[PDB]
Design a protein around this ligand. Sequence first.
Ligand SMILES: O=P(O)(O)OC[C@H]1O[C@](O)(COP(=O)(O)O)[C@@H](O)[C@@H]1O
Lengths: 552, 551
Amino acid sequence: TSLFKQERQKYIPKLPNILKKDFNNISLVYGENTEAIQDRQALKEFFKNTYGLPIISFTEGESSLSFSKALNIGIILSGGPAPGGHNVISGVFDAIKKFNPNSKLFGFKGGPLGLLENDKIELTESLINSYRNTGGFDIVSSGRTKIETEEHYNKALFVAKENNLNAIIIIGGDDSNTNAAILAEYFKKNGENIQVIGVPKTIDADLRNDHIEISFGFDSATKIYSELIGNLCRDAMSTKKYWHFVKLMGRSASHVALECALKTHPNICIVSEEVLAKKKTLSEIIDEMVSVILKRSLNGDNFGVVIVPEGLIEFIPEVKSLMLELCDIFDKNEGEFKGLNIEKMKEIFVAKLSDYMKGVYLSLPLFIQFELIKSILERDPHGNFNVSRVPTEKLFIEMIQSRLNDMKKRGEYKGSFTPVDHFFGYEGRSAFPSNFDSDYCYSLGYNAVVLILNGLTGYMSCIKNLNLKPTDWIAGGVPLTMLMNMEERYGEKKPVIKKALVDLEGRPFKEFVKNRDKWALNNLYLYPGPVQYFGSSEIVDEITETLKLELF
Amino acid sequence: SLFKQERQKYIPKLPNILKKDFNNISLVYGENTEAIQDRQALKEFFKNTYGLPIISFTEGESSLSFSKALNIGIILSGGPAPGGHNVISGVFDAIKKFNPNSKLFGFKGGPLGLLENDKIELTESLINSYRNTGGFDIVSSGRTKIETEEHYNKALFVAKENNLNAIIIIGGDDSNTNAAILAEYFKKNGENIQVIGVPKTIDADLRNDHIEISFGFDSATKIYSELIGNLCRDAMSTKKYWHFVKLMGRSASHVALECALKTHPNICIVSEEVLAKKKTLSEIIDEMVSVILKRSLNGDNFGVVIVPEGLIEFIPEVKSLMLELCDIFDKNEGEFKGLNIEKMKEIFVAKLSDYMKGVYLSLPLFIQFELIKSILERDPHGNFNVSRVPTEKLFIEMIQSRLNDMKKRGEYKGSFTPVDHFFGYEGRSAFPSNFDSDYCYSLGYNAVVLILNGLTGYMSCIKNLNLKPTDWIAGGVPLTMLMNMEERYGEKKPVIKKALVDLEGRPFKEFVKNRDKWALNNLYLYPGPVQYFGSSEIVDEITETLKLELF
Ligand SMILES: O=P(O)(O)OC[C@H]1O[C@](O)(COP(=O)(O)O)[C@@H](O)[C@@H]1O
């Protein structure tokens, strides 16, 4: 397309030294016998044929392989895009073609649904070439259909068989890596010989553990967000008149928010996990932001930058309690709402709420009051709600203006508060991957094929030592069951892999805690650049602050 | 920041001429000049600096108007543009070269810093930490308009007390308006203080035959196009979202048009064309809806739209409304003195003419209030606040309604999922590209050469910008040639005329040729992040606009 794209296309991703060796010269080294996180008992029931598989690692030396004929592989992309997905695919292609030039790669379109519907294309050399080192999932598009029913699982197998597949690779987050486990068990249960391999994808870093150091895409997304946030800090510093509020996409955790904070040194950054842990109130959050603004104003600084995660309102205990009460006032007094008008029925809630929750409700902006009513009036069959109708940054902005307007009227705020809001997310997830994600993703995909060539199913492709140069990285496999627990929902116990949230005892969070009061009151902004793909190795192979601190 | 550390070490590239000794660089005088329009009245006002000659530099001797160390003052004005700090580093390096005893003084927060004698000395170690960086934060900036005899008296007193040989003003059309009049004041009153302007703005609305582009436009459009290309790729990857992207640019669509030529979005609105064709808001809406429907029938329930922030000043019915709201406020200001926005709205509605009131009340309520704020938050030069007006959200709401109208007859079976964006503040203080780094350093270094050669009332000017920096031509354009008479705050005044998109120009014509293609097909281009190290080709890329314009 652009000159950038053609040049980037020519980049050769860097492999672990071992993945460079011939396939006959790569030996399995078996590990222990893994166990689940919890419900170690019931996970032996559900996953009879797959459980307690050892962790796999790879070392040099002679080995015999499970194939000699050409392989056929199906590949699925599920969920939202992450920079480097296309490199997982280029790595798989390059690996099967090295093994046997007659091997074929089939890309199922628009998620797992493509497999159910036999909606696919053959990825050929010239096709693959155009996608090398590119952003996007647009080689085959993604979706998020789950394979659940017996009718579904049988079609998956049907389509797999009529396409002569030896294996399926699924690239996705927590939920598709869980699904990958059950498909692997399903094939093995019905005596079929199709292997399933999982690959760890998410720009939000909510898939990770002792074995998976990071998910793919998080490096590239945070670099883009931090460049944009650093640029806003520099603009704020230059004109000294605007408070920029930046919401970042992803409602599950503060991994992205925390990393951008470490990259840019903003004046304020809110961590959802901490808000939940310290049980902070809405007014406490507001008090704390207002106090930073006033103090800066007294230093003569009528500007600053705030970072908030998208899922923040769902981490305020007080808000859920207010919500659970309002719809209890709705589930009871059903006939009283006929028939009603809202604004008229608002004062019904206002008169019926408990003293303190009425104070919380009325503290909100008026449009927010109404959006909570609408949230209840639209609960799913199981009666549960979500607060998606309330935008975190805009809620905070209005409440802050209000507090400050009152203070000005009684003469305790001389400064000027002019807010500008920003929401980033879509422009970071289909960006060109950094060298790190390019190397990492290419490695994961290449490694997936080695796992398949050794007969393995139910494994997640895994590359460790990610803080070191790629030649020094270590390749292997993690069994999918060991990451699981049983989640109970509506009388049922389905297997799950739980979201990894920010560890409030981790080095990243502790680093942030150590320095945040200093960043708040002073102007110690750091200005990261755009992602570089040419120049010295330490610029082009820079990793996240997160990974740097966590490992070491 | 490791990036900043490595980038700080870049050596900007100068025109060959500027590398020669200052006693080796001679003038070439040329064509005389005049203003763009209202030339008669402007010849009264600018009686001392009208019709000066175009300047170039060549290898020779030249009469050097200075034998003793220089004292220069320097002003950063208006909104930031990447490379302002390289302008400053080019002035500093040049005056140190000339005479190591030369001092450079930075006035803080724009022209107000001059008026209030608020400054800092810009020293070698201070300049060093800002080399090749984004931002205007070395001294910060502001948008103050110097008009009154007292303001100019003050400007004179501060200038004279600081023993200043020359003042360098870095800014846009608003600031070079200040600079033009200041040079005229100093001359008319008989003083030896020289005033040189520098052509800054991400909006590129400071342009003529001689000034090929303003600095910062290159860097800003590059970051904005990276992001839009990323949104195009996400839309292609997931196939469900219609992205509406507002862009900075102020009045002109130079920014929007460049980003469209960089990315091939499905829709880009060009305000200048809207005004030429006298389109109504409703007509713009329907043209967008038609594109959306067609794509949907083709199975593409996604796309990307570029919206210029200045559009409201180019739709005849809305422009007219905004001028009447302005007129109503300016004439009944005391009534509005204390009131909230709802009470303000009530007055505005009561005082609008019947036609204008119907227009106003046809807008969504959120737009009704933002229009008022647009008027109330006019800058010191009288510009409306268009950056705060969510034009893209107005588009989304009106398109949403029309698509529901088609859906009501079974004529639109897709689901519309719009996403709003506004790329602006995040592009202004970004790290400058090699182009802007090279161009800005040359412009500052060149302003010193012009000062050394006794000039005042000139814009620093580097020509042949599509060529390798060594092959650039250095010189100077008289500030008056850019000027005309306009009404600001209910009164007629001399200003630099804003250069808008030329509908007969090569950039717009390239867009028209391909735009229909880009609407119905998915022909997106994906520019990457600006590269600062590496192959001469990717690192020294320039804008589509500049290539087409010099072709
Ligand atoms: O910085 P502000 O006061 O919000 O004003 C925004 C305006 O400044 C700009 O970013 C730059 O304008 P100038 O280059 O003319 O100073 C415009 O694009 C935008 O309309």
